[PDB]
Amino acid sequence: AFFQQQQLPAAMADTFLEHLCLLDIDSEPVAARSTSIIATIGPASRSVERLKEMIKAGMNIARLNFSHGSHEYHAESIANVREAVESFAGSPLSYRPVAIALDTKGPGSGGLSEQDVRDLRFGVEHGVDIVFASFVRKASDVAAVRAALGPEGHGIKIISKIENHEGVKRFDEILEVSDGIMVARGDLGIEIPAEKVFLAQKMMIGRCNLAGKPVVCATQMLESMITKPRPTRAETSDVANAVLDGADCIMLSGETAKGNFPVEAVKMQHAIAREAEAAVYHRQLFEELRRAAPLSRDPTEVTAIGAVEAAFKCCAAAIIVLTTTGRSAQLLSRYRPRAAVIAVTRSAQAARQVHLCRGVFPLLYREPPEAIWADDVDRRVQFGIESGKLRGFLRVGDLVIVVTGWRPGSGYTNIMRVLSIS
Amino acid sequence: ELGTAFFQQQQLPAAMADTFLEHLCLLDIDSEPVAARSTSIIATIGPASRSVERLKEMIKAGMNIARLNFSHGSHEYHAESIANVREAVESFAGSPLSYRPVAIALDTKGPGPGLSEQDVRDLRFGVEHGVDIVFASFVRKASDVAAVRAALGPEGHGIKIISKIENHEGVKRFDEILEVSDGIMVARGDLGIEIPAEKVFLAQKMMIGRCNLAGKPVVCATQMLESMITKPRPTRAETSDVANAVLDGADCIMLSGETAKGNFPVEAVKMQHAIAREAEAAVYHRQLFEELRRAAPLSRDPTEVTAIGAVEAAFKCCAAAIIVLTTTGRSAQLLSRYRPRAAVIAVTRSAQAARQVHLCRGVFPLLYREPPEAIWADDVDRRVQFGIESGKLRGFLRVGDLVIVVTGWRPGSGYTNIMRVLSIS
Amino acid sequence: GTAFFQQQQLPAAMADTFLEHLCLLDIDSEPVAARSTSIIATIGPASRSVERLKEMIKAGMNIARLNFSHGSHEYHAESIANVREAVESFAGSPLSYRPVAIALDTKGPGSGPGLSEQDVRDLRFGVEHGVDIVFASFVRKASDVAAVRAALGPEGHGIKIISKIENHEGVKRFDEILEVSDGIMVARGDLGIEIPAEKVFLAQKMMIGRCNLAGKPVVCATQMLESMITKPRPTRAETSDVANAVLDGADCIMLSGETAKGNFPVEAVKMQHAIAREAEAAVYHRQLFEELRRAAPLSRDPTEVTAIGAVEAAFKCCAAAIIVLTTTGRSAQLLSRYRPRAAVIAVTRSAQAARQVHLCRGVFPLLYREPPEAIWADDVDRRVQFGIESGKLRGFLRVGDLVIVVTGWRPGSGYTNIMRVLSIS
Amino acid sequence: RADVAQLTQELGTAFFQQQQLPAAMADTFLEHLCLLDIDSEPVAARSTSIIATIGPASRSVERLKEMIKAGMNIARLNFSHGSHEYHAESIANVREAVESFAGSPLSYRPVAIALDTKGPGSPGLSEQDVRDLRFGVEHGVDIVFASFVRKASDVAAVRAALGPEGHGIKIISKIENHEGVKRFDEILEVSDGIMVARGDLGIEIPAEKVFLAQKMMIGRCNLAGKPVVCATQMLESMITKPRPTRAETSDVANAVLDGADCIMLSGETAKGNFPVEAVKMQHAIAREAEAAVYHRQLFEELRRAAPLSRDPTEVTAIGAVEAAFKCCAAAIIVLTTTGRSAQLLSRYRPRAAVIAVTRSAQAARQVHLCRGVFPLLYREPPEAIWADDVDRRVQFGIESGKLRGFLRVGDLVIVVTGWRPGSGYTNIMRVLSIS
Numbered sequence A: 001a002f003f004q005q006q007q008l009p010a011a012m013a014d015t016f017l018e019h020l021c022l023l024d025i026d027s028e029p030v031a032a033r034s035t036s037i038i039a040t041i042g043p044a045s046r047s048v049e050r051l052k053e054m055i056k057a058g059m060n061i062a063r064l065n066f067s068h069g070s071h072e073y074h075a076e077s078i079a080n081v082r083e084a085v086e087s088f089a090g091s092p093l094s095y096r097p098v099a100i101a102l103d104t105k106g107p108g109s110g111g112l113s114e115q116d117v118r119d120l121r122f123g124v125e126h127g128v129d130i131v132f133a134s135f136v137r138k139a140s141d142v143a144a145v146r147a148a149l150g151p152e153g154h155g156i157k158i159i160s161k162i163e164n165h166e167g168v169k170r171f172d173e174i175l176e177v178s179d180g181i182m183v184a185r186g187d188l189g190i191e192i193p194a195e196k197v198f199l200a201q202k203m204m205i206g207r208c209n210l211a212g213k214p215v216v217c218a219t220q221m222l223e224s225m226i227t228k229p230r231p232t233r234a235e236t237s238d239v240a241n242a243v244l245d246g247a248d249c250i251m252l253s254g255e256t257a258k259g260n261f262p263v264e265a266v267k268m269q270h271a272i273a274r275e276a277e278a279a280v281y282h283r284q285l286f287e288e289l290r291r292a293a294p295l296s297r298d299p300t301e302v303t304a305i306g307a308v309e310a311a312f313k314c315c316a317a318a319i320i321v322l323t324t325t326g327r328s329a330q331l332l333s334r335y336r337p338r339a340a341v342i343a344v345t346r347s348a349q350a351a352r353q354v355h356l357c358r359g360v361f362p363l364l365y366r367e368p369p370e371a372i373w374a375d376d377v378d379r380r381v382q383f384g385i386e387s388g389k390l391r392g393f394l395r396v397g398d399l400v401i402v403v404t405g406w407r408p409g410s411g412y413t414n415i416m417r418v419l420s421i422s
Numbered sequence B: 001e002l003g004t005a006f007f008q009q010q011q012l013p014a015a016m017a018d019t020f021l022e023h024l025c026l027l028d029i030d031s032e033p034v035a036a037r038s039t040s041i042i043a044t045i046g047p048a049s050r051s052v053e054r055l056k057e058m059i060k061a062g063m064n065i066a067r068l069n070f071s072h073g074s075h076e077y078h079a080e081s082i083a084n085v086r087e088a089v090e091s092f093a094g095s096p097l098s099y100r101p102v103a104i105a106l107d108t109k110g111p112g113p114g115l116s117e118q119d120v121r122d123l124r125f126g127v128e129h130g131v132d133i134v135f136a137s138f139v140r141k142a143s144d145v146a147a148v149r150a151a152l153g154p155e156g157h158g159i160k161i162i163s164k165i166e167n168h169e170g171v172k173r174f175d176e177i178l179e180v181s182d183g184i185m186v187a188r189g190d191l192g193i194e195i196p197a198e199k200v201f202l203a204q205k206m207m208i209g210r211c212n213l214a215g216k217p218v219v220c221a222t223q224m225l226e227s228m229i230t231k232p233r234p235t236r237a238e239t240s241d242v243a244n245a246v247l248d249g250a251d252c253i254m255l256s257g258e259t260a261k262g263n264f265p266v267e268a269v270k271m272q273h274a275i276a277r278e279a280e281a282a283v284y285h286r287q288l289f290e291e292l293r294r295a296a297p298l299s300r301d302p303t304e305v306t307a308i309g310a311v312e313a314a315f316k317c318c319a320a321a322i323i324v325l326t327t328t329g330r331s332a333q334l335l336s337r338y339r340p341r342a343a344v345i346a347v348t349r350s351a352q353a354a355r356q357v358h359l360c361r362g363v364f365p366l367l368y369r370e371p372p373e374a375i376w377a378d379d380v381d382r383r384v385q386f387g388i389e390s391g392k393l394r395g396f397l398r399v400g401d402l403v404i405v406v407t408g409w410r411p412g413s414g415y416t417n418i419m420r421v422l423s424i425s
Numbered sequence C: 001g002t003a004f005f006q007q008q009q010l011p012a013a014m015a016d017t018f019l020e021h022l023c024l025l026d027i028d029s030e031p032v033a034a035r036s037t038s039i040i041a042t043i044g045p046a047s048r049s050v051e052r053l054k055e056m057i058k059a060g061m062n063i064a065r066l067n068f069s070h071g072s073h074e075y076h077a078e079s080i081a082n083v084r085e086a087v088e089s090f091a092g093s094p095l096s097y098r099p100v101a102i103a104l105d106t107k108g109p110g111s112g113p114g115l116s117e118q119d120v121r122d123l124r125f126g127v128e129h130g131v132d133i134v135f136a137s138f139v140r141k142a143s144d145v146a147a148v149r150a151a152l153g154p155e156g157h158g159i160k161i162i163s164k165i166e167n168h169e170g171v172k173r174f175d176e177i178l179e180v181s182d183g184i185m186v187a188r189g190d191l192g193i194e195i196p197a198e199k200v201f202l203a204q205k206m207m208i209g210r211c212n213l214a215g216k217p218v219v220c221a222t223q224m225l226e227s228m229i230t231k232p233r234p235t236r237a238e239t240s241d242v243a244n245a246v247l248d249g250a251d252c253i254m255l256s257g258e259t260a261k262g263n264f265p266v267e268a269v270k271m272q273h274a275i276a277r278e279a280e281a282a283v284y285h286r287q288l289f290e291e292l293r294r295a296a297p298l299s300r301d302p303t304e305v306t307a308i309g310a311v312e313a314a315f316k317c318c319a320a321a322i323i324v325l326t327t328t329g330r331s332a333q334l335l336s337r338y339r340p341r342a343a344v345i346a347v348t349r350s351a352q353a354a355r356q357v358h359l360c361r362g363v364f365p366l367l368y369r370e371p372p373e374a375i376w377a378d379d380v381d382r383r384v385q386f387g388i389e390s391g392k393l394r395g396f397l398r399v400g401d402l403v404i405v406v407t408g409w410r411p412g413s414g415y416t417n418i419m420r421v422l423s424i425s
Numbered sequence D: 001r002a003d004v005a006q007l008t009q010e011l012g013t014a015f016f017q018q019q020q021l022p023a024a025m026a027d028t029f030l031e032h033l034c035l036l037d038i039d040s041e042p043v044a045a046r047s048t049s050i051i052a053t054i055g056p057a058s059r060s061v062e063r064l065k066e067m068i069k070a071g072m073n074i075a076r077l078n079f080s081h082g083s084h085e086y087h088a089e090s091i092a093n094v095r096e097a098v099e100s101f102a103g104s105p106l107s108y109r110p111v112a113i114a115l116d117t118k119g120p121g122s123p124g125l126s127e128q129d130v131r132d133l134r135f136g137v138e139h140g141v142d143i144v145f146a147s148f149v150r151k152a153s154d155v156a157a158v159r160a161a162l163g164p165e166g167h168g169i170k171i172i173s174k175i176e177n178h179e180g181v182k183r184f185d186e187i188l189e190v191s192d193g194i195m196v197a198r199g200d201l202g203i204e205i206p207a208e209k210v211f212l213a214q215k216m217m218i219g220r221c222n223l224a225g226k227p228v229v230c231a232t233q234m235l236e237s238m239i240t241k242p243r244p245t246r247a248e249t250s251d252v253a254n255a256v257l258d259g260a261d262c263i264m265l266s267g268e269t270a271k272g273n274f275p276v277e278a279v280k281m282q283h284a285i286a287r288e289a290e291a292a293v294y295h296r297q298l299f300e301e302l303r304r305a306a307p308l309s310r311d312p313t314e315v316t317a318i319g320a321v322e323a324a325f326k327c328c329a330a331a332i333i334v335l336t337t338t339g340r341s342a343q344l345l346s347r348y349r350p351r352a353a354v355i356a357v358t359r360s361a362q363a364a365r366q367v368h369l370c371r372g373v374f375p376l377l378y379r380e381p382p383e384a385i386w387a388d389d390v391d392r393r394v395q396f397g398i399e400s401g402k403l404r405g406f407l408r409v410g411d412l413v414i415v416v417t418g419w420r421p422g423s424g425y426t427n428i429m430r431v432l433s434i435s
């Protein structure tokens, strides 16, 4: 029965063609949904009660579009998101972190606009986790956004939105200085011929997967759900294909900001992403990611590939990783393991931001610290196991891969262990 | 000899990549498509696209197959639409650069247990009106196809039956249905109501993959450009859906309400044409050909053996086209199953085969009407040169190009066994 | 039949990985195909008699090597005459006649910077006596090959120059030497003294791989069955060395003292024949063909394009043979570079080309002696029928087999462009 | 180039020109062959073990010290010749020559002692074999090369004749005839490893078919993760000549490229005029051939073919080998009691040396059967705290590694350990930087 679920017959195929031939509508997804859902918060999804339903439906990142509303309006939305999120902190083995992303208005006819400088300052003051920088055309646009975030906003992730021909042509220099990319198909579909957007999307997703950096697929994914309770056949296909292309995140704009079915749109993206993640041909994907990833003498990078290889060898239910900044979880995520990457962190901000990396399930550690650092690490690993059991990721008898470091502090990941559950 | 400019067009840098991941990384929005659009467009003919003048614009925009949905209208209404399609098609017989065969497909209302009374009458209407294809609704098992086949009376055994898979049973019994059908339609409208909407993409990818492996045509249908029923431009999900159907391996893409009743029928055809051309150049032929080769069983049929040799030869020299002589369309279909990048120019005397080969990706039919030469080898050479001169006229070929020419050793269908490499003079 | 698929290591041939291919090799799976790696036998006192040379031709000797490091011009002229007498003794039965090449192996440069004056005289003797191949000793750079070519003069333009790589400089300048040579000999005797003995296998494997990639003949030479100079059976290392030279991709394997001066010249030829047949069936064609195709550049030469199409067609149907008409041997060489499992039966009127194509693995030359038919197409057909009749007599073909036939569109060399699938009747 | 650019800037272009690294990075086997370079020098320690037959030409303690220095890892005693007294004296001389270097862990070299049986002659285990096997147990031999194994019951008979005191002895079944080849799978299943005995095999089956049997058995042993020895006439002419033939060097190189864990010398060391030179020649060829292995395809094929495993030692071994390839690790240091954790690393054919730290003198000798395993015998008494004892053993491996030239400051090493004492609990992989 285990080998009939999660498209495992299609996963064992010797060619991509045979893998497609073996895809089965009766093979149910079992693994947790790996692709994060970004929901735009607006009039239809602002209330605390509505936000609780959206968190339960699967929203991982709340996007505030600074092209609309005001600072007062967006601060109220942020407060409602935080109130809805913290309303679940009662059960420590089930709490779900939710990131807050600020999407800028953009430069318009002009460097960094004066409104963007003020909105970026608002983001820093309100503790946003991510900035989706509109109309990034070159590396210097990213540097300007980074400067406007100042010294207090050093830890904020900058996801550059590629929205025009110049951004596509200068993609490599933009990706080099950004934390990640957003394929902003709305403007891209007006800036370049509409029939070429899929080439830009597939190229950028492939290059971000190669670089090990997050990539978001955005705009009109479930557009008809703004007024209708069910999406079109093209819309479900678009969501599934963004996941199969390799997108770390999928986004909802008007579907959640102003539409009549915000919760249903999140549930639809969740249901499609789960099905599409099981349909990924890991045999080819892992081999290609492995071959293309450069040789490295960084112990975190070396441990990450060893851990992902070990996870595939035993059909590991999860890879539990201890991380301060999210980096060790990101390096595991770049190899696209089928095993969930359960990231146990004390940083509330890192827990929110690792939603940008596919297959990373953040757990915020809130238990008393042990006197012995070796015993503290073991408590954090046991926390990951207990949360995993409660959430359905793990069961007694499962094998897990545990990734830890040799000394406290960020940058010292170097250990992989094979653990049997209970 | 060819030039660096040649190797920058039609996603040739992405085509040379050693992995699928590197192929995606090399896709370039500035690399322009050069080859003719190979995925056929099926347009549903209804009130918005019924007039002879509108049909001429749809043919110019790229419509290859006219679909008549017998779930709506009447026999009289559909006969008038068929007459208008044939009048619009024959209005271009005076210009070789514009004349294009257009197939006529009848889409049945559907089943009750067996074949419905109305379907028996509509299938009889199809035979009497000389339709080329039947899109059989709600095919659930092999016996449903046999019933449709039996209904195509004594005169319609040459009509292609494309079985529409619209529910759980059709998906589960897919292999037995494909075995007795000429092809498959992934009918996503009903499929998305019969099975969970989030599972339709799995059924689509599986059926397209299995049809590609069997060498049989597969149509992707329903809501591909849905918003274009009321809007002049499609959504980002819609253009992606059309491109991904082509990348999945679909031989045909379809328009339903977009052309039957919408405000932008011609624009919807133009949009499918533009997207399919871009998507066909983005196909990773290096892996596709290797996998089609490895999965296809060994064959002692000369047509099949010649077809793989011709496709291998075409890739080796970047041949502008593979010109094939065919009476039934079968030799062109066997070339199409290996997904050559070279256009398959099929020269035929059969007007029906010319219309029907639109079901096979990359087949460009040329109907030949010259009287037969007394010496067969001369009649063969005349048809080969007709394909080259039509190719030159349409932009497929230029002097100095290499073409692969597929023929047989004796007249009559079923004897293809020769592949030749010709330099265009 | 199931019996067909158990022979010639076909279970190992279908394996999905090289490791599984090795695991499926079966000592009970008998070789069926004709031996495709040519055997070069050095002529000396143990192999000079006309009667002994007839036994060596029957055992499998394809090329007779004359070693100009020993004996006078008078001795080599008698060797040539004896070889020709033994070869022409079988000319009375044209369907079974086996051409045998005569290769001249030069003394070399010695302490000098390039072409010696003895080499100049010996090379002129070769042209005057009609040698087919020169094995140029101690080639260190491209200018050494040009000097050999100049010493052959205007009458020796058709002689093949196989450069012997025997020292460090030759290995380091390999690419420039291969570019101007017709092929290479891995001369392991001197190579094993010029470079560390434990490195010779790396030089052998590298040069064989680069010659396979270039589509040029490579010979593996020296001490392959050394112990058979005095013993009737070889050592375990010797049989392994011959099998591994074939698995590496060598077109030819050589015997030196084993046939020139040893006690078992005929047995040494029979042993190389038996090993080579076993090793050729053990070649993992699935990976080899895929790698040869991926590495071979795109080509606009119709002979090369037809050759890859013909090899692809032959693999698709398990063709017993590829029958090719050739004037210079070039069309057969271009088929051979893709390493088909099907035997390449080359029909030619050129006695020299028939001898020289032995340098290419899997090419079986047939010398056609009939004068040309008045109708060119009939002359082509008669030559194809001669290939079929010789093939049936020799065991290559049977009624019911499929063969691929490669011909051209006009008389004269350079116009191969047609591939055809023929059923043997 | 992009997959090696940062590491090329760090380690240098000179590093990437040695040990056939340009051929190792090739995308196809054909391009890998085209990139093999006679100027690319081997750097890694020789990983294929050399089995030398001990006889009249190689029996003296002084000669044996030269053979150990030349590279002999396993001393074979052929019970088809000599007597119990003769073989006991050879064993004592091997042990005296081996223990003469026991003054330091950076000079000590464990050497296994293998007993090769006479065989059954004309069906069951012969009476002479029962006595010779009893001699082996009494003299503490590490391995038995069982002659003419034809079926699984032949290896059970050898195991029974070894008795309750010889349970730890490795049984390597010699495949010497058609029946042994045909019943190979059942024989490998119950044996510790295999020997392709080409001498008898070349007389029992057609000589032109021996290479098929050799390549098939080596491939199946590689797939099973069990040791395979290539034997007989590898350097035959070196019995009387100081240099081998071109076919002989090719045969040794091709046995290593085929996947043999061990290569053997018979008359070359037992009775020949150049025993030390024959060992040196096998050492030099094996080092060149190991660097020429196309690891990219080999590792991918070993992974595709190996079934999924829920054994933590197996899971840790593949993770450690993957990690070693990612950073061009100089070594994988593994703690082992029986040799099993080192054997599971060896089955994935890492380019990194597997330095196996063990307290078992017998396991240190027996791991020579596994390609790429370098045994270090740890002699210190156990620390009070087990975690400290583990750390001391890992540091012993690092210090021996530095002293012997396997490791340098700045190198990355992979360290493989377990969660509790005792055999069977390996489950940890660590990446350590050498300081």
Ligand SMILES: O=C(O)C[C@@](O)(CC(=O)N1CCN(S(=O)(=O)c2cc3c(c(O)c2O)C(=O)c2ccccc2C3=O)CC1)C(=O)O
Pocket: A040, A041, A042, A043, A064, A065, A066, A067, A068, A069, A070, A073, A105, A106, A186, A253, A254, A255, A257, A258
């Ligand atoms: O800036 C650009 O480059 C272009 C553009 O303005 C395009 C545009 O006009 N759009 C229409 C509005 N939608 S929306 O329905 O998703 C949407 C609507 C609203 C808000 C959004 O954040 C939002 O994203 C509010 O914040 C919001 C706040 C207060 C009251 C109402 C709302 C609200 O109606 C997005 C697309 C854009 O922004 O891309």
Ligand SMILES: O=C(O)C[C@@](O)(CC(=O)N1CCN(S(=O)(=O)c2cc3c(c(O)c2O)C(=O)c2ccccc2C3=O)CC1)C(=O)O
Pocket: B044, B045, B046, B047, B068, B069, B070, B071, B072, B073, B074, B077, B109, B110, B189, B256, B257, B258, B260, B261
């Ligand atoms: O049969 C089924 O199982 C379900 C269904 O009936 C579903 C359905 O009701 N649909 C609404 C109509 N569209 S349509 O806009 O594409 C479309 C509309 C019309 C016609 C169509 O052929 C047609 O396909 C006429 O022939 C037509 C003829 C005469 C007057 C008007 C029209 C016309 O308005 C298709 C979807 C179907 O058929 O799938």
Ligand SMILES: O=C(O)C[C@@](O)(CC(=O)N1CCN(S(=O)(=O)c2cc3c(c(O)c2O)C(=O)c2ccccc2C3=O)CC1)C(=O)O
Pocket: D053, D054, D055, D056, D077, D078, D079, D080, D081, D082, D083, D086, D118, D119, D147, D199, D266, D267, D268, D270, D271
């Ligand atoms: O029974 C078999 O399986 C067949 C066979 O006996 C074949 C055979 O006869 N051989 C000849 C002898 N060689 S040998 O030169 O390597 C060699 C020679 C001698 C010894 C060997 O162990 C030995 O291996 C002594 O122990 C030895 C001890 C005391 C005095 C002299 C010697 C000595 O001359 C091996 C091959 C075999 O064993 O395969």
Ligand SMILES: O=P(O)(O)OC[C@H]1O[C@](O)(COP(=O)(O)O)[C@@H](O)[C@@H]1O
Pocket: A322, A323, A324, A325, A326, A327, A328, A329, A403, A404, A405, A406, A407, A408, A409, A410, A411, A412, A413
């Ligand atoms: O992923 P990051 O940011 O590098 O953090 C990983 C770090 O987490 C640890 O596992 C635990 O560190 P802390 O005790 O500081 O939480 C370190 O050993 C390791 O260096």
Ligand SMILES: O=P(O)(O)OC[C@H]1O[C@](O)(COP(=O)(O)O)[C@@H](O)[C@@H]1O
Pocket: B325, B326, B327, B328, B329, B330, B331, B332, B406, B407, B408, B409, B410, B411, B412, B413, B414, B415, B416
């Ligand atoms: O694809 P089909 O229907 O088998 O037709 C292929 C046939 O066409 C030809 O090339 C030409 O035949 P005709 O002259 O009868 O048209 C035949 O030699 C070959 O058998």
Ligand SMILES: O=P(O)(O)OC[C@H]1O[C@](O)(COP(=O)(O)O)[C@@H](O)[C@@H]1O
Pocket: C303, C325, C326, C327, C328, C329, C330, C331, C332, C379, C406, C407, C408, C409, C410, C411, C412, C413, C414, C415, C416
């Ligand atoms: O292999 P080559 O030397 O190019 O010769 C091939 C030539 O042989 C032919 O098949 C027959 O030519 P001939 O009639 O002159 O022998 C030509 O059509 C073709 O060009």
Ligand SMILES: O=P(O)(O)OC[C@H]1O[C@](O)(COP(=O)(O)O)[C@@H](O)[C@@H]1O
Pocket: D313, D335, D336, D337, D338, D339, D340, D341, D342, D416, D417, D418, D419, D420, D421, D422, D423, D424, D425, D426
């Ligand atoms: O390879 P083996 O035979 O399983 O031995 C590995 C064992 O060695 C250890 O690393 C150390 O064990 P000891 O302390 O008993 O020597 C164990 O944790 C592990 O189980």
Ligand SMILES: O=C([O-])C(=O)[O-]
Pocket: A134, A161, A163, A183, A184, A185, A186, A187, A188, A218, A219
């Ligand atoms: O801003 C966006 O999200 C877009 O344009 O797609």
Ligand SMILES: O=C([O-])C(=O)[O-]
Pocket: B137, B164, B166, B186, B187, B188, B189, B190, B191, B221, B222
């Ligand atoms: O009938 C159709 O076309 C459908 O259901 O999608």
Ligand SMILES: O=C([O-])C(=O)[O-]
Pocket: C137, C164, C166, C186, C187, C188, C189, C190, C191, C221, C222
């Ligand atoms: O010249 C040769 O043949 C040699 O050196 O091997």
Ligand SMILES: O=C([O-])C(=O)[O-]
Pocket: D147, D174, D176, D196, D197, D198, D199, D200, D201, D231, D232
């Ligand atoms: O017994 C042996 O070692 C042999 O036959 O090779």
Ligand SMILES: [K+]
Pocket: A065, A066, A067, A103, A104, A105, A106, A134
């Ligand atoms: K915005």
Ligand SMILES: [K+]
Pocket: B069, B070, B071, B107, B108, B109, B110, B137
């Ligand atoms: K219908």
Ligand SMILES: [K+]
Pocket: C067, C068, C069, C105, C106, C107, C108, C137
């Ligand atoms: K010579």
Ligand SMILES: [K+]
Pocket: D078, D079, D080, D116, D117, D118, D119, D147
């Ligand atoms: K013995």
Ligand SMILES: [Mg+2]
Pocket: A134, A163, A184, A186, A187
């Ligand atoms: Mg935008």
